[PDB]
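Example complex used in Figure S2.
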Amino acid sequence: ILSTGKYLNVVRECGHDVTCPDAKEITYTLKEQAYVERIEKAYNYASKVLLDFLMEEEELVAHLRSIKHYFLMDQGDFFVHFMDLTEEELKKPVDDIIPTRLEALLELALRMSTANTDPFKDDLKIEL
Amino acid sequence: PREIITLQLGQCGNQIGFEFWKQLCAEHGISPEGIVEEFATEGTDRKDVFFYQADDEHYIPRAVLLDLEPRVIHSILNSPYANLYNPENIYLSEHGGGAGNNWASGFSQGEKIHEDIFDIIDREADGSDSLEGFVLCHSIAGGTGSGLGSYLLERLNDRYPKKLVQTYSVFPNQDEMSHVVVQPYNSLLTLKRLTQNADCVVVLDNTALNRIATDRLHIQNPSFSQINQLVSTIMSASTTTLRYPGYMNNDLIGLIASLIPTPRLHFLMTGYTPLTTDQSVASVRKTTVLDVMRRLLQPKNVMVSTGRDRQTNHCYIAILNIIQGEVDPTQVHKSLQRIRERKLANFIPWGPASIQVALSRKSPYLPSAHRVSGLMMANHTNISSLFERTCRQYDKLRKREAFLEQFRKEDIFKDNFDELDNSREIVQQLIDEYHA
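Predicted assembly (564 residues):
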């Protein structure tokens, strides 16, 4: 009952009408045993309808793919173009104006590889 | 205000200006004989900058067309776009000319019709009290456009001294020399007048036309009906800041001022990529501006025959990259971000360079408000390769005793051949000296 209301406050702070346990607001019971079975149906729907909204309707499964394509270096076609393009700028000690030029060659290696999940790769920043 | 008088002249200069005015009605939303669409004022915010200003909402063209050959004008009046032209501004019906094929013909005909050639073309000058200048839409090929066009570059230099002069001149073809043989003589005589008696030119090569006319256009027999399609679009493309409402370099003295390094160095390289109609089915997916200027500096859209291995010792000084219509201007600074990383333009080691990009909204039309367009106005110092090509074909012809007895009977008494040779080498030496 702690973790359910933790879910319910972070969906109340997002839209104040987009709450996960809608169409299930059935009142409590007076019983020595059966109020944990009342909680056992309140958990199972509230965390299930929270999963598919973030993962599918907000595409959280597509955000780890862009993490995989750069950190784990999976899709290497744009990456080795960019990795060859970090070579001509890191063949010298680092300066302040160099990370302003890495993002030039990053998105020059990106949109020459003409992908359609590229909006998920525009959330990537370069640290040097 | 900003009224320009176009000087269409010659056998080729009249046809490239005929569809230039025919291009302007399709983008202004107007008809050559009426006004049937209301898109002319709500969509286009300025129309009286090349046309004459209206008396009945009939935008008269500010154009004059003289030629010795009557064949180019007899293919005009049967077309339904000739009623927009006036039969009192230039000529009435049944206008003629010479016989005639000579550079010395039109050079000698300028001072015998001297009273009439400076009478009706000056009536359009005082229509606006602030005249922009004169563009000589003439030709170099043949003796018709080259003979008479060299005369008006001299007498309009002092009678109208405070006006801009700059021409869209087409270069002749140098493939074989059978039909014409007078091509090295009449070209260099006009090319001297294009540097000291003229401020700027816009070069348009003929051997580079069929390089593009078989590139994506897929023709088997090259005809003259394709020479007006590449030329008329880039003419209207060059005035998109001037015709359509722009802010910076919205005048013709705005664009040319930011590109010329010095006098006698004004030969501007032109580039224009989008000419294919089946690209239209894939521009619906937000084709961006980040890929259209990567191919401008790449020598693919150029209209200048130059050497491919001569670009390492030559340096760009001024390069113009004009985007039109839908630009998505939140990434136009992103396109200019990627320029310094490649260094596709060699920069001059003595001074700074400049990559100028500008935009203007196009016509309210479906092939215009959907597909990205890129107009290039380069200035590279490899242009002496054409001047080395024309000079090597000039001194080789004078040692073969060709047209030295057949050319000096009329109005030529002294040898003015080396007067053109040294001044051409002055251009070729000051270009290589310009990068110290």
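Residues 166 and 200 of chain B are 5 Å apart (CA to CA). The interface with chain A takes residues 288, 290-291, 334, 337-338, 340-341 of chain B (CB under 8 Å).
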